[PDB]
Design a protein around this ligand. Structure first.
Ligand SMILES: [Cl-]
Length: 213
């Protein structure tokens, strides 16, 4: 259904619902957490991550996981696979805890995606082109402390990206990357076996367990 309570990550509030930029639908918060980004081996930067999906992911697509505890879901790789494969709209909201240039952020996440694609043997030139669109978008942006990125999977292969320096929710999506493998790999970056954020995965297992009841 629809979550009622916000989750706060390093002081940053994630609301229990969000309407993706340009969208009419409201997505429910599933969980939130943190990850680190390495800049030149001398700096580790932190981002806060919030994971949202259509309410329907609970009512329909994750019914087989009913009655499991959070502490039963977090170790089950099949559970997170079902989540990332669910045919529903999803949104990941990123807040910059301290500042990054667009190229700094974009480059780090691009490498996360590339590494996942190579592990799957799905890093050809269709994906290479898509990742350059991804890189080119982020190179133009600035992410001072408190800025936000909205990654919106509006379809299984359609990644809509929006940003705002003041943390406000944009009225429309700004860029779109259409590539099935890149879209799926970015979901894996956050929620897969090799996730950059065990804390987000644990929170999402808790939030889904609660919603399933
Ligand atoms: Cl991130």
């Amino acid at each position: 259904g629809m979550a009622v309570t916000k989750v706060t990550v390093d002081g940053i509030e994630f609301p229990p619902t969000i309407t993706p930029p340009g969208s009419s639908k409201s997505l429910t918060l599933l969980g939130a957490g943190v990850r680190g980004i390495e800049i030149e081996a001398i700096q580790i930067k932190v981002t806060a991550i919030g994971v949202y999906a259509e309410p329907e992911v609970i009512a329909s697509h994750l019914q087989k996981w009913k009655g499991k505890s959070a502490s039963e879901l977090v170790e089950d790789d099949g559970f997170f696979k079902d989540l990332v494969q669910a045919p529903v709209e999803k949104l990941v909201k990123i807040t910059m805890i301290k500042g990054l240039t667009g190229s700094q952020y974009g480059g780090a996440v691009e490498e996360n995606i590339k590494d996942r694609l190579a592990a799957l043997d799905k890093y050809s030139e269709a994906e290479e082109e898509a990742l350059e669109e991804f890189r080119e978008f982020f190179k133009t942006k600035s992410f001072p402390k408190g800025s936000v990125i909205f990654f919106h999977w509006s379809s299984p292969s359609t990644l809509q990206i929006s940003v705002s320096t003041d943390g406000s929710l944009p009225e429309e999506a700004e860029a779109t990357v259409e590539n099935a493998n890149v879209a799926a790999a970015l979901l894996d970056v956050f929620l897969g076996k090799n996730s950059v954020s065990p804390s987000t995965k644990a929170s999402v297992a808790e939030g889904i367990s609660a919603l399933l009841m």
